[PDB]
Amino acid sequence: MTKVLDVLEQFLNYHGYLYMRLDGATKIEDRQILTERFNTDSRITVFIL
DNA sequence: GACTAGGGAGTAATCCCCTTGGCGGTTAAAACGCGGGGGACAGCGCGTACGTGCGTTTAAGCGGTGCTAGAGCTGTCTACGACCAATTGAGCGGCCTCGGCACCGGGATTCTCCAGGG
């Protein structure tokens, strides 16, 4: 459920976690750069899809 | 006359196709905002084309007339139209194409803007 994602988001911001998201309302190029950035790097902790 | 055999309907189980709602993904149309510029409109001047006063006539209303050819109603008949159905064919109800329409691409053609010099 998409309504769950933001429910997680304000939760994740409550714990000071570094995270990002990917759902069906994201532009294709933004989606590709997001997954490319997540493949590298290590500070970003959780990816919610 | 007593009981026997078989099949479509009565009862019933199988299938299974058909949809009710909700929810997510994704493209297209609608929604919103800015730079700038062209359309709206004021201020004005004028001239010349009507707005208006008065003289001097033709003309509709006036007042009447003597009828004259077209309009309304009186018979009267008779050519014709609204009354059954057999028909039987003119035409519609349902299906099966291939062709013109749908629509997009490569190109020639054409319509428009600018910053300069000419």
**Torsion region of A41: left, alpha or beta (phi above 0 gives left; psi -120 to 50 gives alpha):** left
- Adjacent-strand bridge partners of A21: A48
Q: How far is the CA of A49 from the C1' of B51 (A)?
A: 87
Residue A41's SS3 state is coil
Helices (H), chain A: 2-14, 28-39
Q: How far is the CA of A37 from the C1' of B117 (A)?
A: 55
Residue A25's SS3 state is coil
Q: How far is the CA of A1 from the C1' of B14 (A)?
A: 38
Resolution of the experimentally solved model in angstroms: 3.5
Measured in whole angstroms, the distance separating CA A3 from the mean position of its chain's CA atoms is: 14
- What is each CA distance from A47 to A33, A36, in whole angstroms? 14, 12
Q: What's the one-letter identity of residue A31?
A: R
**Token reading at A21:** 């998201």
Q: Mark the nucleotides of strand B covered by protein, meaning any atom under 7 Å from a CB.
A: 23-26
Pick from A29, A22, A26, A27: which is nearest to A8 by CA? A22
Question: How many Cα atoms occupy the beta-carbon half-sphere of A20 within 13 Å?
Answer: 16
Technique employed here was cryo-EM
